[PDB]
Amino acid sequence: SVERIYQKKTQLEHILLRPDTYIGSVELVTQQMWVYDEDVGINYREVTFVPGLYKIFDEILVNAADNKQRDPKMSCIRVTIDPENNLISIWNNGKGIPVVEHKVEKMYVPALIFGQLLTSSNYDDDEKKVTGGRNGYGAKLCNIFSTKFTVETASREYKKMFKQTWMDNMGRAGEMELKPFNGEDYTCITFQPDLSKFKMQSLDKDIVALMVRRAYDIAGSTKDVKVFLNGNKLPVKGFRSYVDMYLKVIHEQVNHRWEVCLTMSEKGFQQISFVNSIATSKGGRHVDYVADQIVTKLVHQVKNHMWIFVNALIENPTFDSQTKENMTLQPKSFGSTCQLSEKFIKAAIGIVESILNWVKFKAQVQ
Amino acid sequence: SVERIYQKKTQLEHILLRPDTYIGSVELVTQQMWVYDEDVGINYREVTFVPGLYKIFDEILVNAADNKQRDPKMSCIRVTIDPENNLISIWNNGKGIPVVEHKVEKMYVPALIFGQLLTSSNYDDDEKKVTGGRNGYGAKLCNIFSTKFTVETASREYKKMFKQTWMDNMGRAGEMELKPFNGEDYTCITFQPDLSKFKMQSLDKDIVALMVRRAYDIAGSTKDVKVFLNGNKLPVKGFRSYVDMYLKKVIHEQVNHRWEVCLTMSEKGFQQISFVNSIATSKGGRHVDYVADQIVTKLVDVVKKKKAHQVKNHMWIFVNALIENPTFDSQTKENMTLQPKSFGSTCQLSEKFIKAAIGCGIVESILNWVKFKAQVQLN
Ligand SMILES: Nc1ncnc2c1ncn2[C@@H]1O[C@H](COP(=O)(O)OP(=O)(O)O)[C@@H](O)[C@H]1O
Ligand SMILES: Nc1ncnc2c1ncn2[C@@H]1O[C@H](COP(=O)(O)OP(=O)(O)O)[C@@H](O)[C@H]1O
Ligand SMILES: [Mg+2]
Ligand SMILES: [Mg+2]
């Protein structure tokens, strides 16, 4: 009884036993947000989906983007969503993953970082990196919440092609398959989400609408990277064009680590931001960093008329929940500063309207 | 090379290397909240503190209160906060922890659940409990983030007392000293927060005011439990007297063994103060929505006779609830996200409660105000 009452759990068991701790809610939620609907495009609706499922997807997408930092020659990302076969696949070019056995861990690097918990190349904070990768859980959580998870990576360097498959929530893997290789390097993660774990019948419209919009986010938050979806290249060419989709407008590429866009808001303070290609959908201090700067410059009263669009690269970011929707790192510990051109600060005044304040010269009488 | 680049961290290493993920922010934050200041009492001011620090304290406090759902006979919780010595201790009576060796982990239970990760007596969902604990990290996290963590529990049932100290972020631990016992069993854990991991120099005024308010929260949210703060007994007997601190017209009702509600008129927009299994749900959750909405409706009703989200904005509601396997969206359990369908119980206010609700300074203010706005011209 003492043994049945006081239990010790393995890590894998705990993740499956307490999902919401690692990937967020595995229950349905309903809330308004920007999605990209088939035939209608990017719009702001009400949506019902499981955050846990959107997350394991986001994890593999960001890893794809992250590879851009690791290798600048990366040119594009190819996303594939197929509801009927319940298949998702993310592909990226750029330096593949070293297909060689890891001397300390005693196993091939790919099998190590996609099949073992707490494995990562972002564990050394002296590197001060601007990747979304950080905790080393991501790819594994997706693997842990898939019925089938496949990893295929190719590195010219070690001149080999690695391919392996996991099944039943990473509870069993297939036989590692290696082949000689010599070509352009690529990596492709193909997974079948364990929809049972999320109490879903299939990849419905909403969740698909969310994911598709994320591919657009990537296409807009990364640099010199082309994003493909189901075979068609998305029409995003930088942040500005991306921001455009919402406005169909003061802009500025402060530097290599920033880019901001402002515009009026008839619906209170509106913000849309990204940190290392992560969709910080609730906010963060990186967004409050620019806002409060722009605001004060021309002065809460004014902020509420703003629709800010921020896209930054931050060193070793720090977030709230597992849904990483609200960043917190201190503006001091950013790795760079964001200051507007005299121009911007100027071409940003054409929001000012003491008109409502002036017109406030009404009189209340019986 | 490859070995230096791709690393595998250990569970303990990982927690220290990535705090925010287990205990929330390890940085200072500034927000408005109720706290209990020395000599002033409960007040709403601005506060600057580290969530992670508050969390490790809250994990041991809630653990003490969780024991009440384990031994209904528990009757007291004693809390000690010694800034000067950077020491905190939380004492509780009632059934102590089984001082015996765990046959599968081949080590004593106290040592197992306070020193090994992923250990809990709440991994059995079926059991259907209303404790704050559910993930088996809490205690280990207070330990991992303390320079010294001492665990002492006495158990009459096993005729023994246990006592062991851990040190340097659960990196090392002294020897386990056992002794005979047969008195009233109790559990007390003492720890010294590794302030440096929090960028702190000491337990300042702010963080202590918050830790002290939690002590009062426990007094107000646990059933028949006297609470002591540094040897002195907090003057709180049950939820109603707890709610009274916040006030210098109030509606009350203990719906059932798992729900207690207090309602008053608010002048600063919707207001809520609540608890789920003694956890401070500062940002609300489905449980507050469930009680509030049910009240707003009966009020909107008397509105038609003579405004909707407008009604909810005149309300100051207090909710103490016991929920089964509660869920939170954050590293702070400030917002309880479970659906009412899975609560494990219901909470339909009494016909006698709504009646009284219709009479407090509420409708007479909406109607008074609707009237006001009608007889107004804009010149
Ligand atoms: N598309 C990709 N290309 C190259 N390496 C990748 C890719 N996706 C993941 N990785 C590697 O796998 C690890 C990522 O696993 P993950 O669970 O997401 O942890 P994190 O992103 O926090 O580092 C890193 O060590 C990274 O180098
Ligand atoms: N004060 C206490 N009295 C009795 N048992 C306790 C106490 N504190 C902790 N425990 C035991 O230790 C475990 C709690 O560890 P914790 O890390 O807080 O996990 P949990 O999520 O279960 O609360 C449980 O198995 C519980 O029975
Ligand atoms: Mg990752
Ligand atoms: Mg606990």
Curated annotation (Swiss-Prot), chain A:
Tell me what PTMs the record reports for this protein: Phosphorylation has no effect on catalytic activity.
Cellular localization per UniProt: Cytoplasm; Nucleus, Nucleoplasm; Nucleus; Nucleus, Nucleolus
Which top-rank group of organisms is this from?
Eukaryota
**What tissue specificity is annotated for this entry?**
Expressed in the tonsil, spleen, lymph node, thymus, skin, pancreas, testis, colon, kidney, liver, brain and lung. Also found in high-grade lymphomas, squamous cell lung tumors and seminomas.
Which positions does UniProt annotate for ATP binding?
A: 63, 92, 120-122, 133-140, 322-324
Q: Where is this cross-link: Glycyl lysine isopeptide (Lys-Gly) (interchain with G-Cter in SUMO2)?
A: 128-129, 233, 332, 343, 360, 362
Q: What's the family?
A: Belongs to the type II topoisomerase family.
Q: What else is known?
A: Eukaryotic topoisomerase I and II can relax both negative and positive supercoils, whereas prokaryotic enzymes relax only negative supercoils.
Q: Quote the function comment for this protein.
A: Key decatenating enzyme that alters DNA topology by binding to two double-stranded DNA molecules, generating a double-stranded break in one of the strands, passing the intact strand through the broken strand, and religating the broken strand. May play a role in regulating the period length of BMAL1 transcriptional oscillation.
Q: How does it assemble?
A: Homodimer. Interacts with COPS5. Interacts with RECQL5; this stimulates DNA decatenation. Interacts with SETMAR; stimulates the topoisomerase activity. Interacts with DHX9; this interaction occurs in a E2 enzyme UBE2I- and RNA-dependent manner, negatively regulates DHX9-mediated double-stranded DNA and RNA duplex helicase activity and stimulates TOP2A-mediated supercoiled DNA relaxation activity. Interacts with HNRNPU (via C-terminus); this interaction protects the topoisomerase TOP2A from degradation and positively regulates the relaxation of supercoiled DNA in a RNA-dependent manner.
How are the domains described in the entry? The N-terminus has several structural domains; the ATPase domain (about residues 1-265), the transducer domain (about 266-428) and the toprim domain (455-572). Comparing different structures shows ATP hydrolysis induces domain shifts in the N-terminus that are probably part of the mechanism of DNA cleavage and rejoining.
Report the protein name in the record. DNA topoisomerase 2-alpha
Q: What is the native source organism of this protein?
A: Homo sapiens (Human)
Taxonomy, top ranks, is: Eukaryota, Metazoa, Chordata, Craniata, Vertebrata
Q: Which residues of the full protein are shown?
A: 29 to 422 of 1531
